[PDB]
Amino acid sequence: ASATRLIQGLRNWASGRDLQAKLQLRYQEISKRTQPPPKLPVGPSHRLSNNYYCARDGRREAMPPSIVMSSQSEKKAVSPAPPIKRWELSQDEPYL
């Protein structure tokens, strides 16, 4: 955004779009290189009361895999999951 108006007009005609609204070169609109210092918050476990680790352990709740059939009725046939629902068409740009 420093070129003269003739060059901007010829450029806009040749491109077919408006390039002055969206320039690929950054300018003073970007964020400043210096910022105020932040204050990051704490998580949900930063408490002084009722914070026992045995009640919120993640690794210790893992279990060995549940072995079902091992070699040491008229039930229905079963799939691994119900069949996936049919995908709906896009309502924004259906291209149809």
Partner 1 sequence: HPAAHGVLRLVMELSGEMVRKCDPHIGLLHRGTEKLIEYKTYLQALPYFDRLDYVSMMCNEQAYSLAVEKLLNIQPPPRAQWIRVLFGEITRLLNHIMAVTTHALDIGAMTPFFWMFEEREKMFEFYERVSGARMHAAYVRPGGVHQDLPLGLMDDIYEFSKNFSLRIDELEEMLTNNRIWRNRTVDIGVVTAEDALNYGFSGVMLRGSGIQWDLRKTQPYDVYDQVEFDVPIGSRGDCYDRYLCRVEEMRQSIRIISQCLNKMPPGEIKVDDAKVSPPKRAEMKTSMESLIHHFKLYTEGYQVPPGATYTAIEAPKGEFGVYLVSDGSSRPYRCKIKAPGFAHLAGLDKMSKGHMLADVVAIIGTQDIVFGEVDR
Partner 2 sequence: EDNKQFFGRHRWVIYTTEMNGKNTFWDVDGSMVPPEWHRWLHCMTDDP
Partner 3 sequence: TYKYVNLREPSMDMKSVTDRAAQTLLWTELIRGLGMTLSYLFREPATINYPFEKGPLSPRFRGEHALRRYPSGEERCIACKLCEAVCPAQAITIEAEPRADGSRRTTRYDIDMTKCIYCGFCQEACPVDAIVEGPNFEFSTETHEELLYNKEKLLNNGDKWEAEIAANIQADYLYR
Q: Which residues bind partner 3 (CB under 8 A)?
A: 2-3, 7, 10-12, 14-16, 19, 24-25, 37-40, 87-90, 92-96
Contact yes or no for 15/22 (Cβ under 8 A)? no
In this chain, which of 59, 70, 76, 82 binds partner 1, going by CB under 8 A? 59
* Residue 5 C-beta: closest distance to partner 2, Å: 17
Contact yes or no for 68/57 (Cβ under 8 A)? no
State yes or no: residue 80 binds partner 1 (CB under 8 A): no
* Residue 59 C-beta: closest distance to partner 2, Å: 41
State yes or no: residue 25 binds partner 2 (CB under 8 A): yes
Rg (CA), the chain: 31
CA dist 26 → 31, 69, 91 (Å): 10, 64, 35
Q: Amino acid letter at 60?
A: R
State yes or no: residue 3 binds partner 1 (CB under 8 A): no
